[PDB]
Design a protein around this motif. Structure first.
Motif, mmCIF file in Angstrom:
data_model
loop_
_atom_site.group_PDB
_atom_site.id
_atom_site.type_symbol
_atom_site.label_atom_id
_atom_site.label_comp_id
_atom_site.label_asym_id
_atom_site.label_seq_id
_atom_site.Cartn_x
_atom_site.Cartn_y
_atom_site.Cartn_z
ATOM 1 N N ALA A 8 0.735 -1.161 0.023
ATOM 2 C CA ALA A 8 0.177 -0.053 0.017
ATOM 3 C C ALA A 8 0.736 1.151 0.131
ATOM 4 O O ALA A 8 2.005 1.128 0.282
ATOM 5 N N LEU A 9 0.233 2.406 -0.560
ATOM 6 C CA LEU A 9 0.946 3.525 -0.638
ATOM 7 C C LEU A 9 0.840 4.414 0.690
ATOM 8 O O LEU A 9 -0.310 4.204 1.387
ATOM 9 N N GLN A 10 1.749 5.314 1.070
ATOM 10 C CA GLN A 10 1.623 6.101 2.183
ATOM 11 C C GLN A 10 2.779 7.179 2.099
ATOM 12 O O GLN A 10 3.704 7.176 1.549
ATOM 13 N N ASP A 11 2.323 8.206 3.178
ATOM 14 C CA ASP A 11 3.458 9.565 3.096
ATOM 15 C C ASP A 11 4.617 9.007 3.720
ATOM 16 O O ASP A 11 5.779 9.432 3.337
ATOM 17 N N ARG A 12 4.510 8.705 4.819
ATOM 18 C CA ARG A 12 5.530 8.246 5.693
ATOM 19 C C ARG A 12 5.628 7.045 6.149
ATOM 20 O O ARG A 12 4.790 6.520 6.915
ATOM 21 N N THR A 13 6.574 6.139 5.673
ATOM 22 C CA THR A 13 6.624 4.681 5.956
ATOM 23 C C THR A 13 7.746 4.547 6.885
ATOM 24 O O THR A 13 8.977 4.485 6.386
ATOM 25 N N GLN A 14 7.740 3.909 8.013
ATOM 26 C CA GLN A 14 8.681 3.759 9.086
ATOM 27 C C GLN A 14 8.565 2.082 9.633
ATOM 28 O O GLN A 14 7.523 1.510 9.304
ATOM 29 N N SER A 16 9.216 -1.014 12.128
ATOM 30 C CA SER A 16 9.017 -1.403 13.540
ATOM 31 C C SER A 16 9.994 -2.167 14.099
ATOM 32 O O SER A 16 10.669 -3.203 13.362
ATOM 33 N N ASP A 17 10.395 -2.134 15.417
ATOM 34 C CA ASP A 17 11.378 -2.941 16.229
ATOM 35 C C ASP A 17 11.309 -4.343 15.566
ATOM 36 O O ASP A 17 12.515 -4.924 15.337
ATOM 37 N N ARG A 18 10.254 -4.903 15.312
ATOM 38 C CA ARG A 18 10.161 -6.415 14.919
ATOM 39 C C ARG A 18 10.772 -6.059 13.302
ATOM 40 O O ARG A 18 11.540 -7.111 12.955
ATOM 41 N N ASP A 19 10.264 -5.568 12.506
ATOM 42 C CA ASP A 19 10.699 -5.195 11.164
ATOM 43 C C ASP A 19 12.236 -5.353 11.036
ATOM 44 O O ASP A 19 13.006 -5.976 10.298
ATOM 45 N N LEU A 20 12.769 -4.239 11.896
ATOM 46 C CA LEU A 20 14.101 -3.895 11.995
ATOM 47 C C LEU A 20 14.904 -5.197 12.451
ATOM 48 O O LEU A 20 16.030 -5.564 11.694
ATOM 49 N N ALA A 21 14.527 -5.708 13.442
ATOM 50 C CA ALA A 21 15.092 -6.826 13.964
ATOM 51 C C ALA A 21 15.528 -7.793 13.018
ATOM 52 O O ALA A 21 16.833 -8.208 13.242
ATOM 53 N N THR A 22 14.822 -8.122 12.044
ATOM 54 C CA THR A 22 15.225 -9.052 10.792
ATOM 55 C C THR A 22 16.218 -8.241 10.003
ATOM 56 O O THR A 22 17.145 -8.981 9.940
ATOM 57 N N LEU A 23 15.921 -6.980 9.493
ATOM 58 C CA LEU A 23 16.955 -6.508 8.727
ATOM 59 C C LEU A 23 18.342 -6.491 9.462
ATOM 60 O O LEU A 23 19.363 -6.959 8.868
ATOM 61 N N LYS A 24 18.457 -5.688 10.475
ATOM 62 C CA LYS A 24 19.722 -5.397 11.209
ATOM 63 C C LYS A 24 20.340 -6.833 11.586
ATOM 64 O O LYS A 24 21.581 -6.937 11.588
ATOM 65 N N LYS A 25 19.703 -8.040 11.764
ATOM 66 C CA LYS A 25 20.100 -9.019 11.767
ATOM 67 C C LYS A 25 20.974 -9.537 10.705
ATOM 68 O O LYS A 25 22.085 -10.085 11.048
ATOM 69 N N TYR A 26 20.705 -9.241 9.677
ATOM 70 C CA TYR A 26 21.553 -9.634 8.345
ATOM 71 C C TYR A 26 22.640 -8.539 8.363
ATOM 72 O O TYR A 26 23.871 -8.946 7.995
ATOM 73 N N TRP A 27 22.584 -7.400 8.855
ATOM 74 C CA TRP A 27 23.693 -6.366 8.743
ATOM 75 C C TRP A 27 24.996 -6.930 9.610
ATOM 76 O O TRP A 27 26.094 -6.254 9.212
ATOM 77 N N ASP A 28 24.601 -7.867 10.439
ATOM 78 C CA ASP A 28 25.586 -8.319 11.324
ATOM 79 C C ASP A 28 26.623 -9.169 10.460
ATOM 80 O O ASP A 28 27.749 -9.451 10.840
ATOM 81 N N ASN A 29 26.086 -9.456 9.077
ATOM 82 C CA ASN A 29 27.138 -10.062 8.357
ATOM 83 C C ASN A 29 27.665 -9.290 7.106
ATOM 84 O O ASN A 29 27.881 -9.559 6.164
ATOM 85 N N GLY A 30 27.369 -7.948 7.386
ATOM 86 C CA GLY A 30 28.017 -7.050 6.513
ATOM 87 C C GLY A 30 27.087 -6.736 5.375
ATOM 88 O O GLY A 30 27.490 -6.401 4.200
ATOM 89 N N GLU A 54 13.134 -3.637 -3.210
ATOM 90 C CA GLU A 54 13.640 -2.275 -3.299
ATOM 91 C C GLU A 54 13.745 -1.722 -1.872
ATOM 92 O O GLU A 54 14.679 -1.026 -1.393
ATOM 93 N N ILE A 55 12.517 -1.789 -1.182
ATOM 94 C CA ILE A 55 12.222 -1.285 0.231
ATOM 95 C C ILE A 55 13.413 -1.531 1.023
ATOM 96 O O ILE A 55 13.842 -0.627 1.800
ATOM 97 N N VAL A 56 14.105 -2.856 0.976
ATOM 98 C CA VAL A 56 15.096 -3.122 1.626
ATOM 99 C C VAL A 56 16.603 -2.530 1.300
ATOM 100 O O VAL A 56 17.170 -1.830 1.842
ATOM 101 N N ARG A 57 16.878 -2.851 -0.158
ATOM 102 C CA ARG A 57 17.794 -2.366 -0.861
ATOM 103 C C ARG A 57 18.130 -0.862 -0.275
ATOM 104 O O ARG A 57 19.187 -0.407 -0.262
ATOM 105 N N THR A 58 17.144 -0.056 -0.354
ATOM 106 C CA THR A 58 17.179 1.388 0.044
ATOM 107 C C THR A 58 17.565 1.531 1.498
ATOM 108 O O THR A 58 18.348 2.429 1.752
#
Length: 80
Positions: A8-14, A16-30, A54-58
């Motif tokens: 869905a479309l939105q003005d400000r997409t942020q 959540s702790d849960r969502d980030l938890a996953t992403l940041k998890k991969y960041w631990d591998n460079g 894209e949402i991630v790559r960005t």
């Protein structure tokens, strides 16, 4: 056994702790690079959260900057 690229479309997409938890998890591998070198991993975090790759790559490139502001040497490699 599908991906299903829908949202869905939105003005400000942020995220959540849960969502980030996953992403940041991969960041631990460079997971800072965007090229295929890291893409391989992105294809996962994206299919796992069910969000447009894209949402991630960005998100990756974005964060990098955040650090720079403070003056972090998170360029990439160490030396060579």
């Amino acid at each position: 056994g599908s991906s299903g690229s829908s949202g869905a479309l939105q003005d400000r997409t942020q995220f959540s702790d849960r969502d980030l938890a996953t992403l940041k998890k991969y960041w631990d591998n460079g997971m800072t690079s965007l090229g295929s070198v890291c893409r391989e991993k992105i294809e996962a975090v994206a299919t796992e959260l069910n969000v447009d790759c894209e949402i991630v790559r960005t998100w990756i490139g974005n964060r990098r900057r955040k650090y720079r502001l403070m003056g972090i040497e998170v360029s990439g490699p160490s030396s060579g």
